[PDB]
Design an enzyme around this catalytic site. Structure first.
Site, PDB file in Angstrom:
ATOM      1  N   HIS A  55     -29.482 -65.855  46.321  1.00  0.00           N
ATOM      2  CA  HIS A  55     -28.710 -65.128  47.505  1.00  0.00           C
ATOM      3  C   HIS A  55     -27.559 -64.573  46.620  1.00  0.00           C
ATOM      4  O   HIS A  55     -26.915 -64.937  45.650  1.00  0.00           O
ATOM      5  CB  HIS A  55     -28.152 -65.692  48.317  1.00  0.00           C
ATOM      6  CG  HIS A  55     -29.242 -66.370  49.500  1.00  0.00           C
ATOM      7  ND1 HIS A  55     -30.336 -65.534  50.130  1.00  0.00           N
ATOM      8  CD2 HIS A  55     -29.394 -67.692  49.834  1.00  0.00           C
ATOM      9  CE1 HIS A  55     -31.104 -66.311  50.705  1.00  0.00           C
ATOM     10  NE2 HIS A  55     -30.494 -67.704  50.705  1.00  0.00           N
ATOM     11  N   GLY A  56     -27.170 -63.236  46.975  1.00  0.00           N
ATOM     12  CA  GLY A  56     -25.667 -62.848  46.388  1.00  0.00           C
ATOM     13  C   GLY A  56     -25.238 -61.525  47.133  1.00  0.00           C
ATOM     14  O   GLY A  56     -25.691 -61.190  48.182  1.00  0.00           O
TER      15      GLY A  56
END
Ligand code: XVE
Ligand code: XVE
Lengths: 146, 93, 93, 146
Positions: free
Chosen positions: D93-94
Site C-alpha cells: 500500500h502507499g
C-alpha cells in the site's frame, strides 16, 4: 500495406507544434524574489534550438501568475489538429510542484491540467512536453568523487 | 477504448525532486545549456529519452558550483526525466 | 571529478504522482503484469527506457477498471518513469 | 584500441546484481490496512522474470517498517563490486512518497538514500533501479475515449 508497427509518435503532421517559452527574470519587489540573471541566454538558446526543430516558438517574458494561467488556458483552447506535439518551457524561480509567476506561485498541475487528454482534444494521443528550469526545493547535492 | 487523461506527457525537470537548480548568470542554467546542446547534436539521430539521458550525463559530469559561501560551494546536479509517454519520440521522420 | 549523489537512479512508478494504483486479485497488478511481459519480450532487444515506454502503452491501453461502485468504475492508469540515469541501460551485452 | 564510447552502462560484470523484492500482503489489524490479494502473483512473476535476466533474486514477505529499513541498510552495506546493477521492487500500500510496511509507513527517500552515490560506494556509477507498485495518492483517472 506491409506490417505496421506503432512504436513511435506520428511526428509528420503539417506542423511540429507550438513551443511556448515563459521566461521570468524580473519579479515584483513585494515578492522579495531576486532577478534571474542570464535567463535571457536560456530563452534565446531555446528559441533557436526549437526553431531548428521546426517548432512555432512563442516567447513570453515576465508573466504574472494570472497571465501564466491565462496563456496556458488560451493555448490549450487552440486547434492543434495539424500539429504533431506541444512543448512548453518554464524558466523561473520555483519549489516542488510550483513555478513562480512574477507576482506569485502557480501549481504546475494547474498548468498541465489544461492539456489533459480529455481537456485538449486536438492533442489527445500526441506528446505534450514540459521542460522545467526551476528549483524543486532547497536541497544541495554534495556529490561524490569518482 | 480509452486512454488515461495523464498519458502522453513528458516532464523534463532540470533537477531532482526537492533539489535546488543551478544557473550561471553568463552561460545560462546548467540544464538548459545542456539540453539545447544535446538537441542540436542529436535531435536528428536519437530518440528523445536517449537525448535526455545524454543531458543527464552532461549536467552531472561537466558542472560543479563555485562559491565563496561554503554552504553553496562544490555542489552538483542531476536532471530528472519524468515520462508518461506511450511511444518513442523522434523529432525527425 | 564528482557526480551527483542522486545520479544513476531510475524509479519505475506504477502510476502518476497523486494517483491510485490498480491491482487485479487474480492476475496481479496492472503495472507488474505489464512490466514482466515487456521485459520477457524485449529485455534482449531494447534499451530499458524503451521497454518501460512499452509498459506505459500496455497499461494505458489494455486495462480499465470495472466496479459496482460508480466512483471506481471505468478508470484508467498511466505508469510514471522517473530517470536520473546517465547512460543507456541494456540487460544484455 | 579503436574509438571508445561510453553511452551504455557496463553490464558485463561477473554478476548482474541483486533484485530485492519486498512483497507486503498482510498488514497488522491495528493499521486498518486490507490484505493485498494477488500480490503473490506479482511477486512470483518478478522472481521468474528477473531470474531469467540473471539477477540474484531475494524475496521478502510481510515486512514491518523497521524490517524494511534494516533490510535496505544491510543490503546497501554489502560489497556490490562484482555486480553490474541493483534492483529493488516494492509491492505494498502507499501514498505519495511513501511505501507501507505491515505496521506503518516508510519514506521512499529513506530507502533510496542508503544507495546514494556517496553512501554505497560499490554501486557508485552503476544503475540503481527501484520499481514501485503502490498508490501515490487517491486520484482516479477517468480517461478519455479515443
Ligand atoms: O528556495 C529558494 N528559492 C527557490 C524559490 C524562491 C525564490 C525567491 C523567493 C521565494 C521562493 C528557487 O527558485 C531556487 O531560496 C531559498 C534557499 C535556496 C538555497 C538554500 C537555502 C534556501
Ligand atoms: O488511499 C488509500 N489507500 C492507499 C494507502 C493506504 C491503504 C490502507 C490504509 C492506509 C493507507 C493505497 O495503497 C491505494 O485508500 C483510500 C482511498 C482510495 C481510493 C479512493 C479514495 C480513498
Amino acid at each position: 500495406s506491409g506490417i505496421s508497427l506503432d512504436n513511435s509518435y506520428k511526428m509528420d503532421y503539417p506542423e511540429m507544434g507550438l513551443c511556448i517559452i515563459i521566461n521570468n527574470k524580473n519579479f515584483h519587489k513585494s515578492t522579495g524574489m531576486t532577478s534571474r540573471s542570464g535567463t535571457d541566454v536560456d530563452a534565446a538558446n531555446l528559441r533557436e534550438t526549437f526553431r531548428n526543430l521546426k517548432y512555432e516558438v512563442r516567447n513570453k517574458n515576465d508573466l504574472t501568475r494570472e497571465e501564466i494561467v491565462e496563456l496556458m488556458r488560451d493555448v490549450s483552447k487552440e486547434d492543434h489538429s495539424k500539429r504533431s506535439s506541444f512543448v512548453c518551457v518554464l524558466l523561473s524561480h520555483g519549489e516542488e510542484g510550483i513555478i513562480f509567476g512574477t507576482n506569485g506561485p502557480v501549481d504546475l498541475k494547474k498548468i498541465t491540467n489544461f492539456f489533459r487528454g480529455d481537456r485538449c482534444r486536438s492533442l489527445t494521443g500526441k506528446p505534450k512536453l514540459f521542460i522545467i528550469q526551476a528549483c524543486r526545493g532547497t536541497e544541495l547535492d554534495c556529490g561524490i568523487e569518482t | 477504448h480509452k486512454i488515461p487523461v495523464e498519458a502522453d506527457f513528458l516532464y523534463a525537470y532540470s533537477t531532482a525532486p526537492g533539489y535546488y537548480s543551478w544557473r550561471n548568470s553568463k552561460d545560462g542554467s546548467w540544464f538548459i545549456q545542456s539540453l539545447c546542446a544535446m538537441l542540436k547534436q542529436y535531435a536528428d539521430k536519437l530518440e528523445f529519452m536517449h537525448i535526455l539521458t545524454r543531458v543527464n550525463r552532461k549536467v552531472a559530469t561537466e558542472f560543479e558550483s563555485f562559491s565563496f559561501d561554503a554552504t553553496f560551494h562544490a555542489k552538483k546536479q542531476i536532471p530528472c526525466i519524468v515520462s508518461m509517454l506511450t511511444k518513442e519520440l523522434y523529432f525527425y521522420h
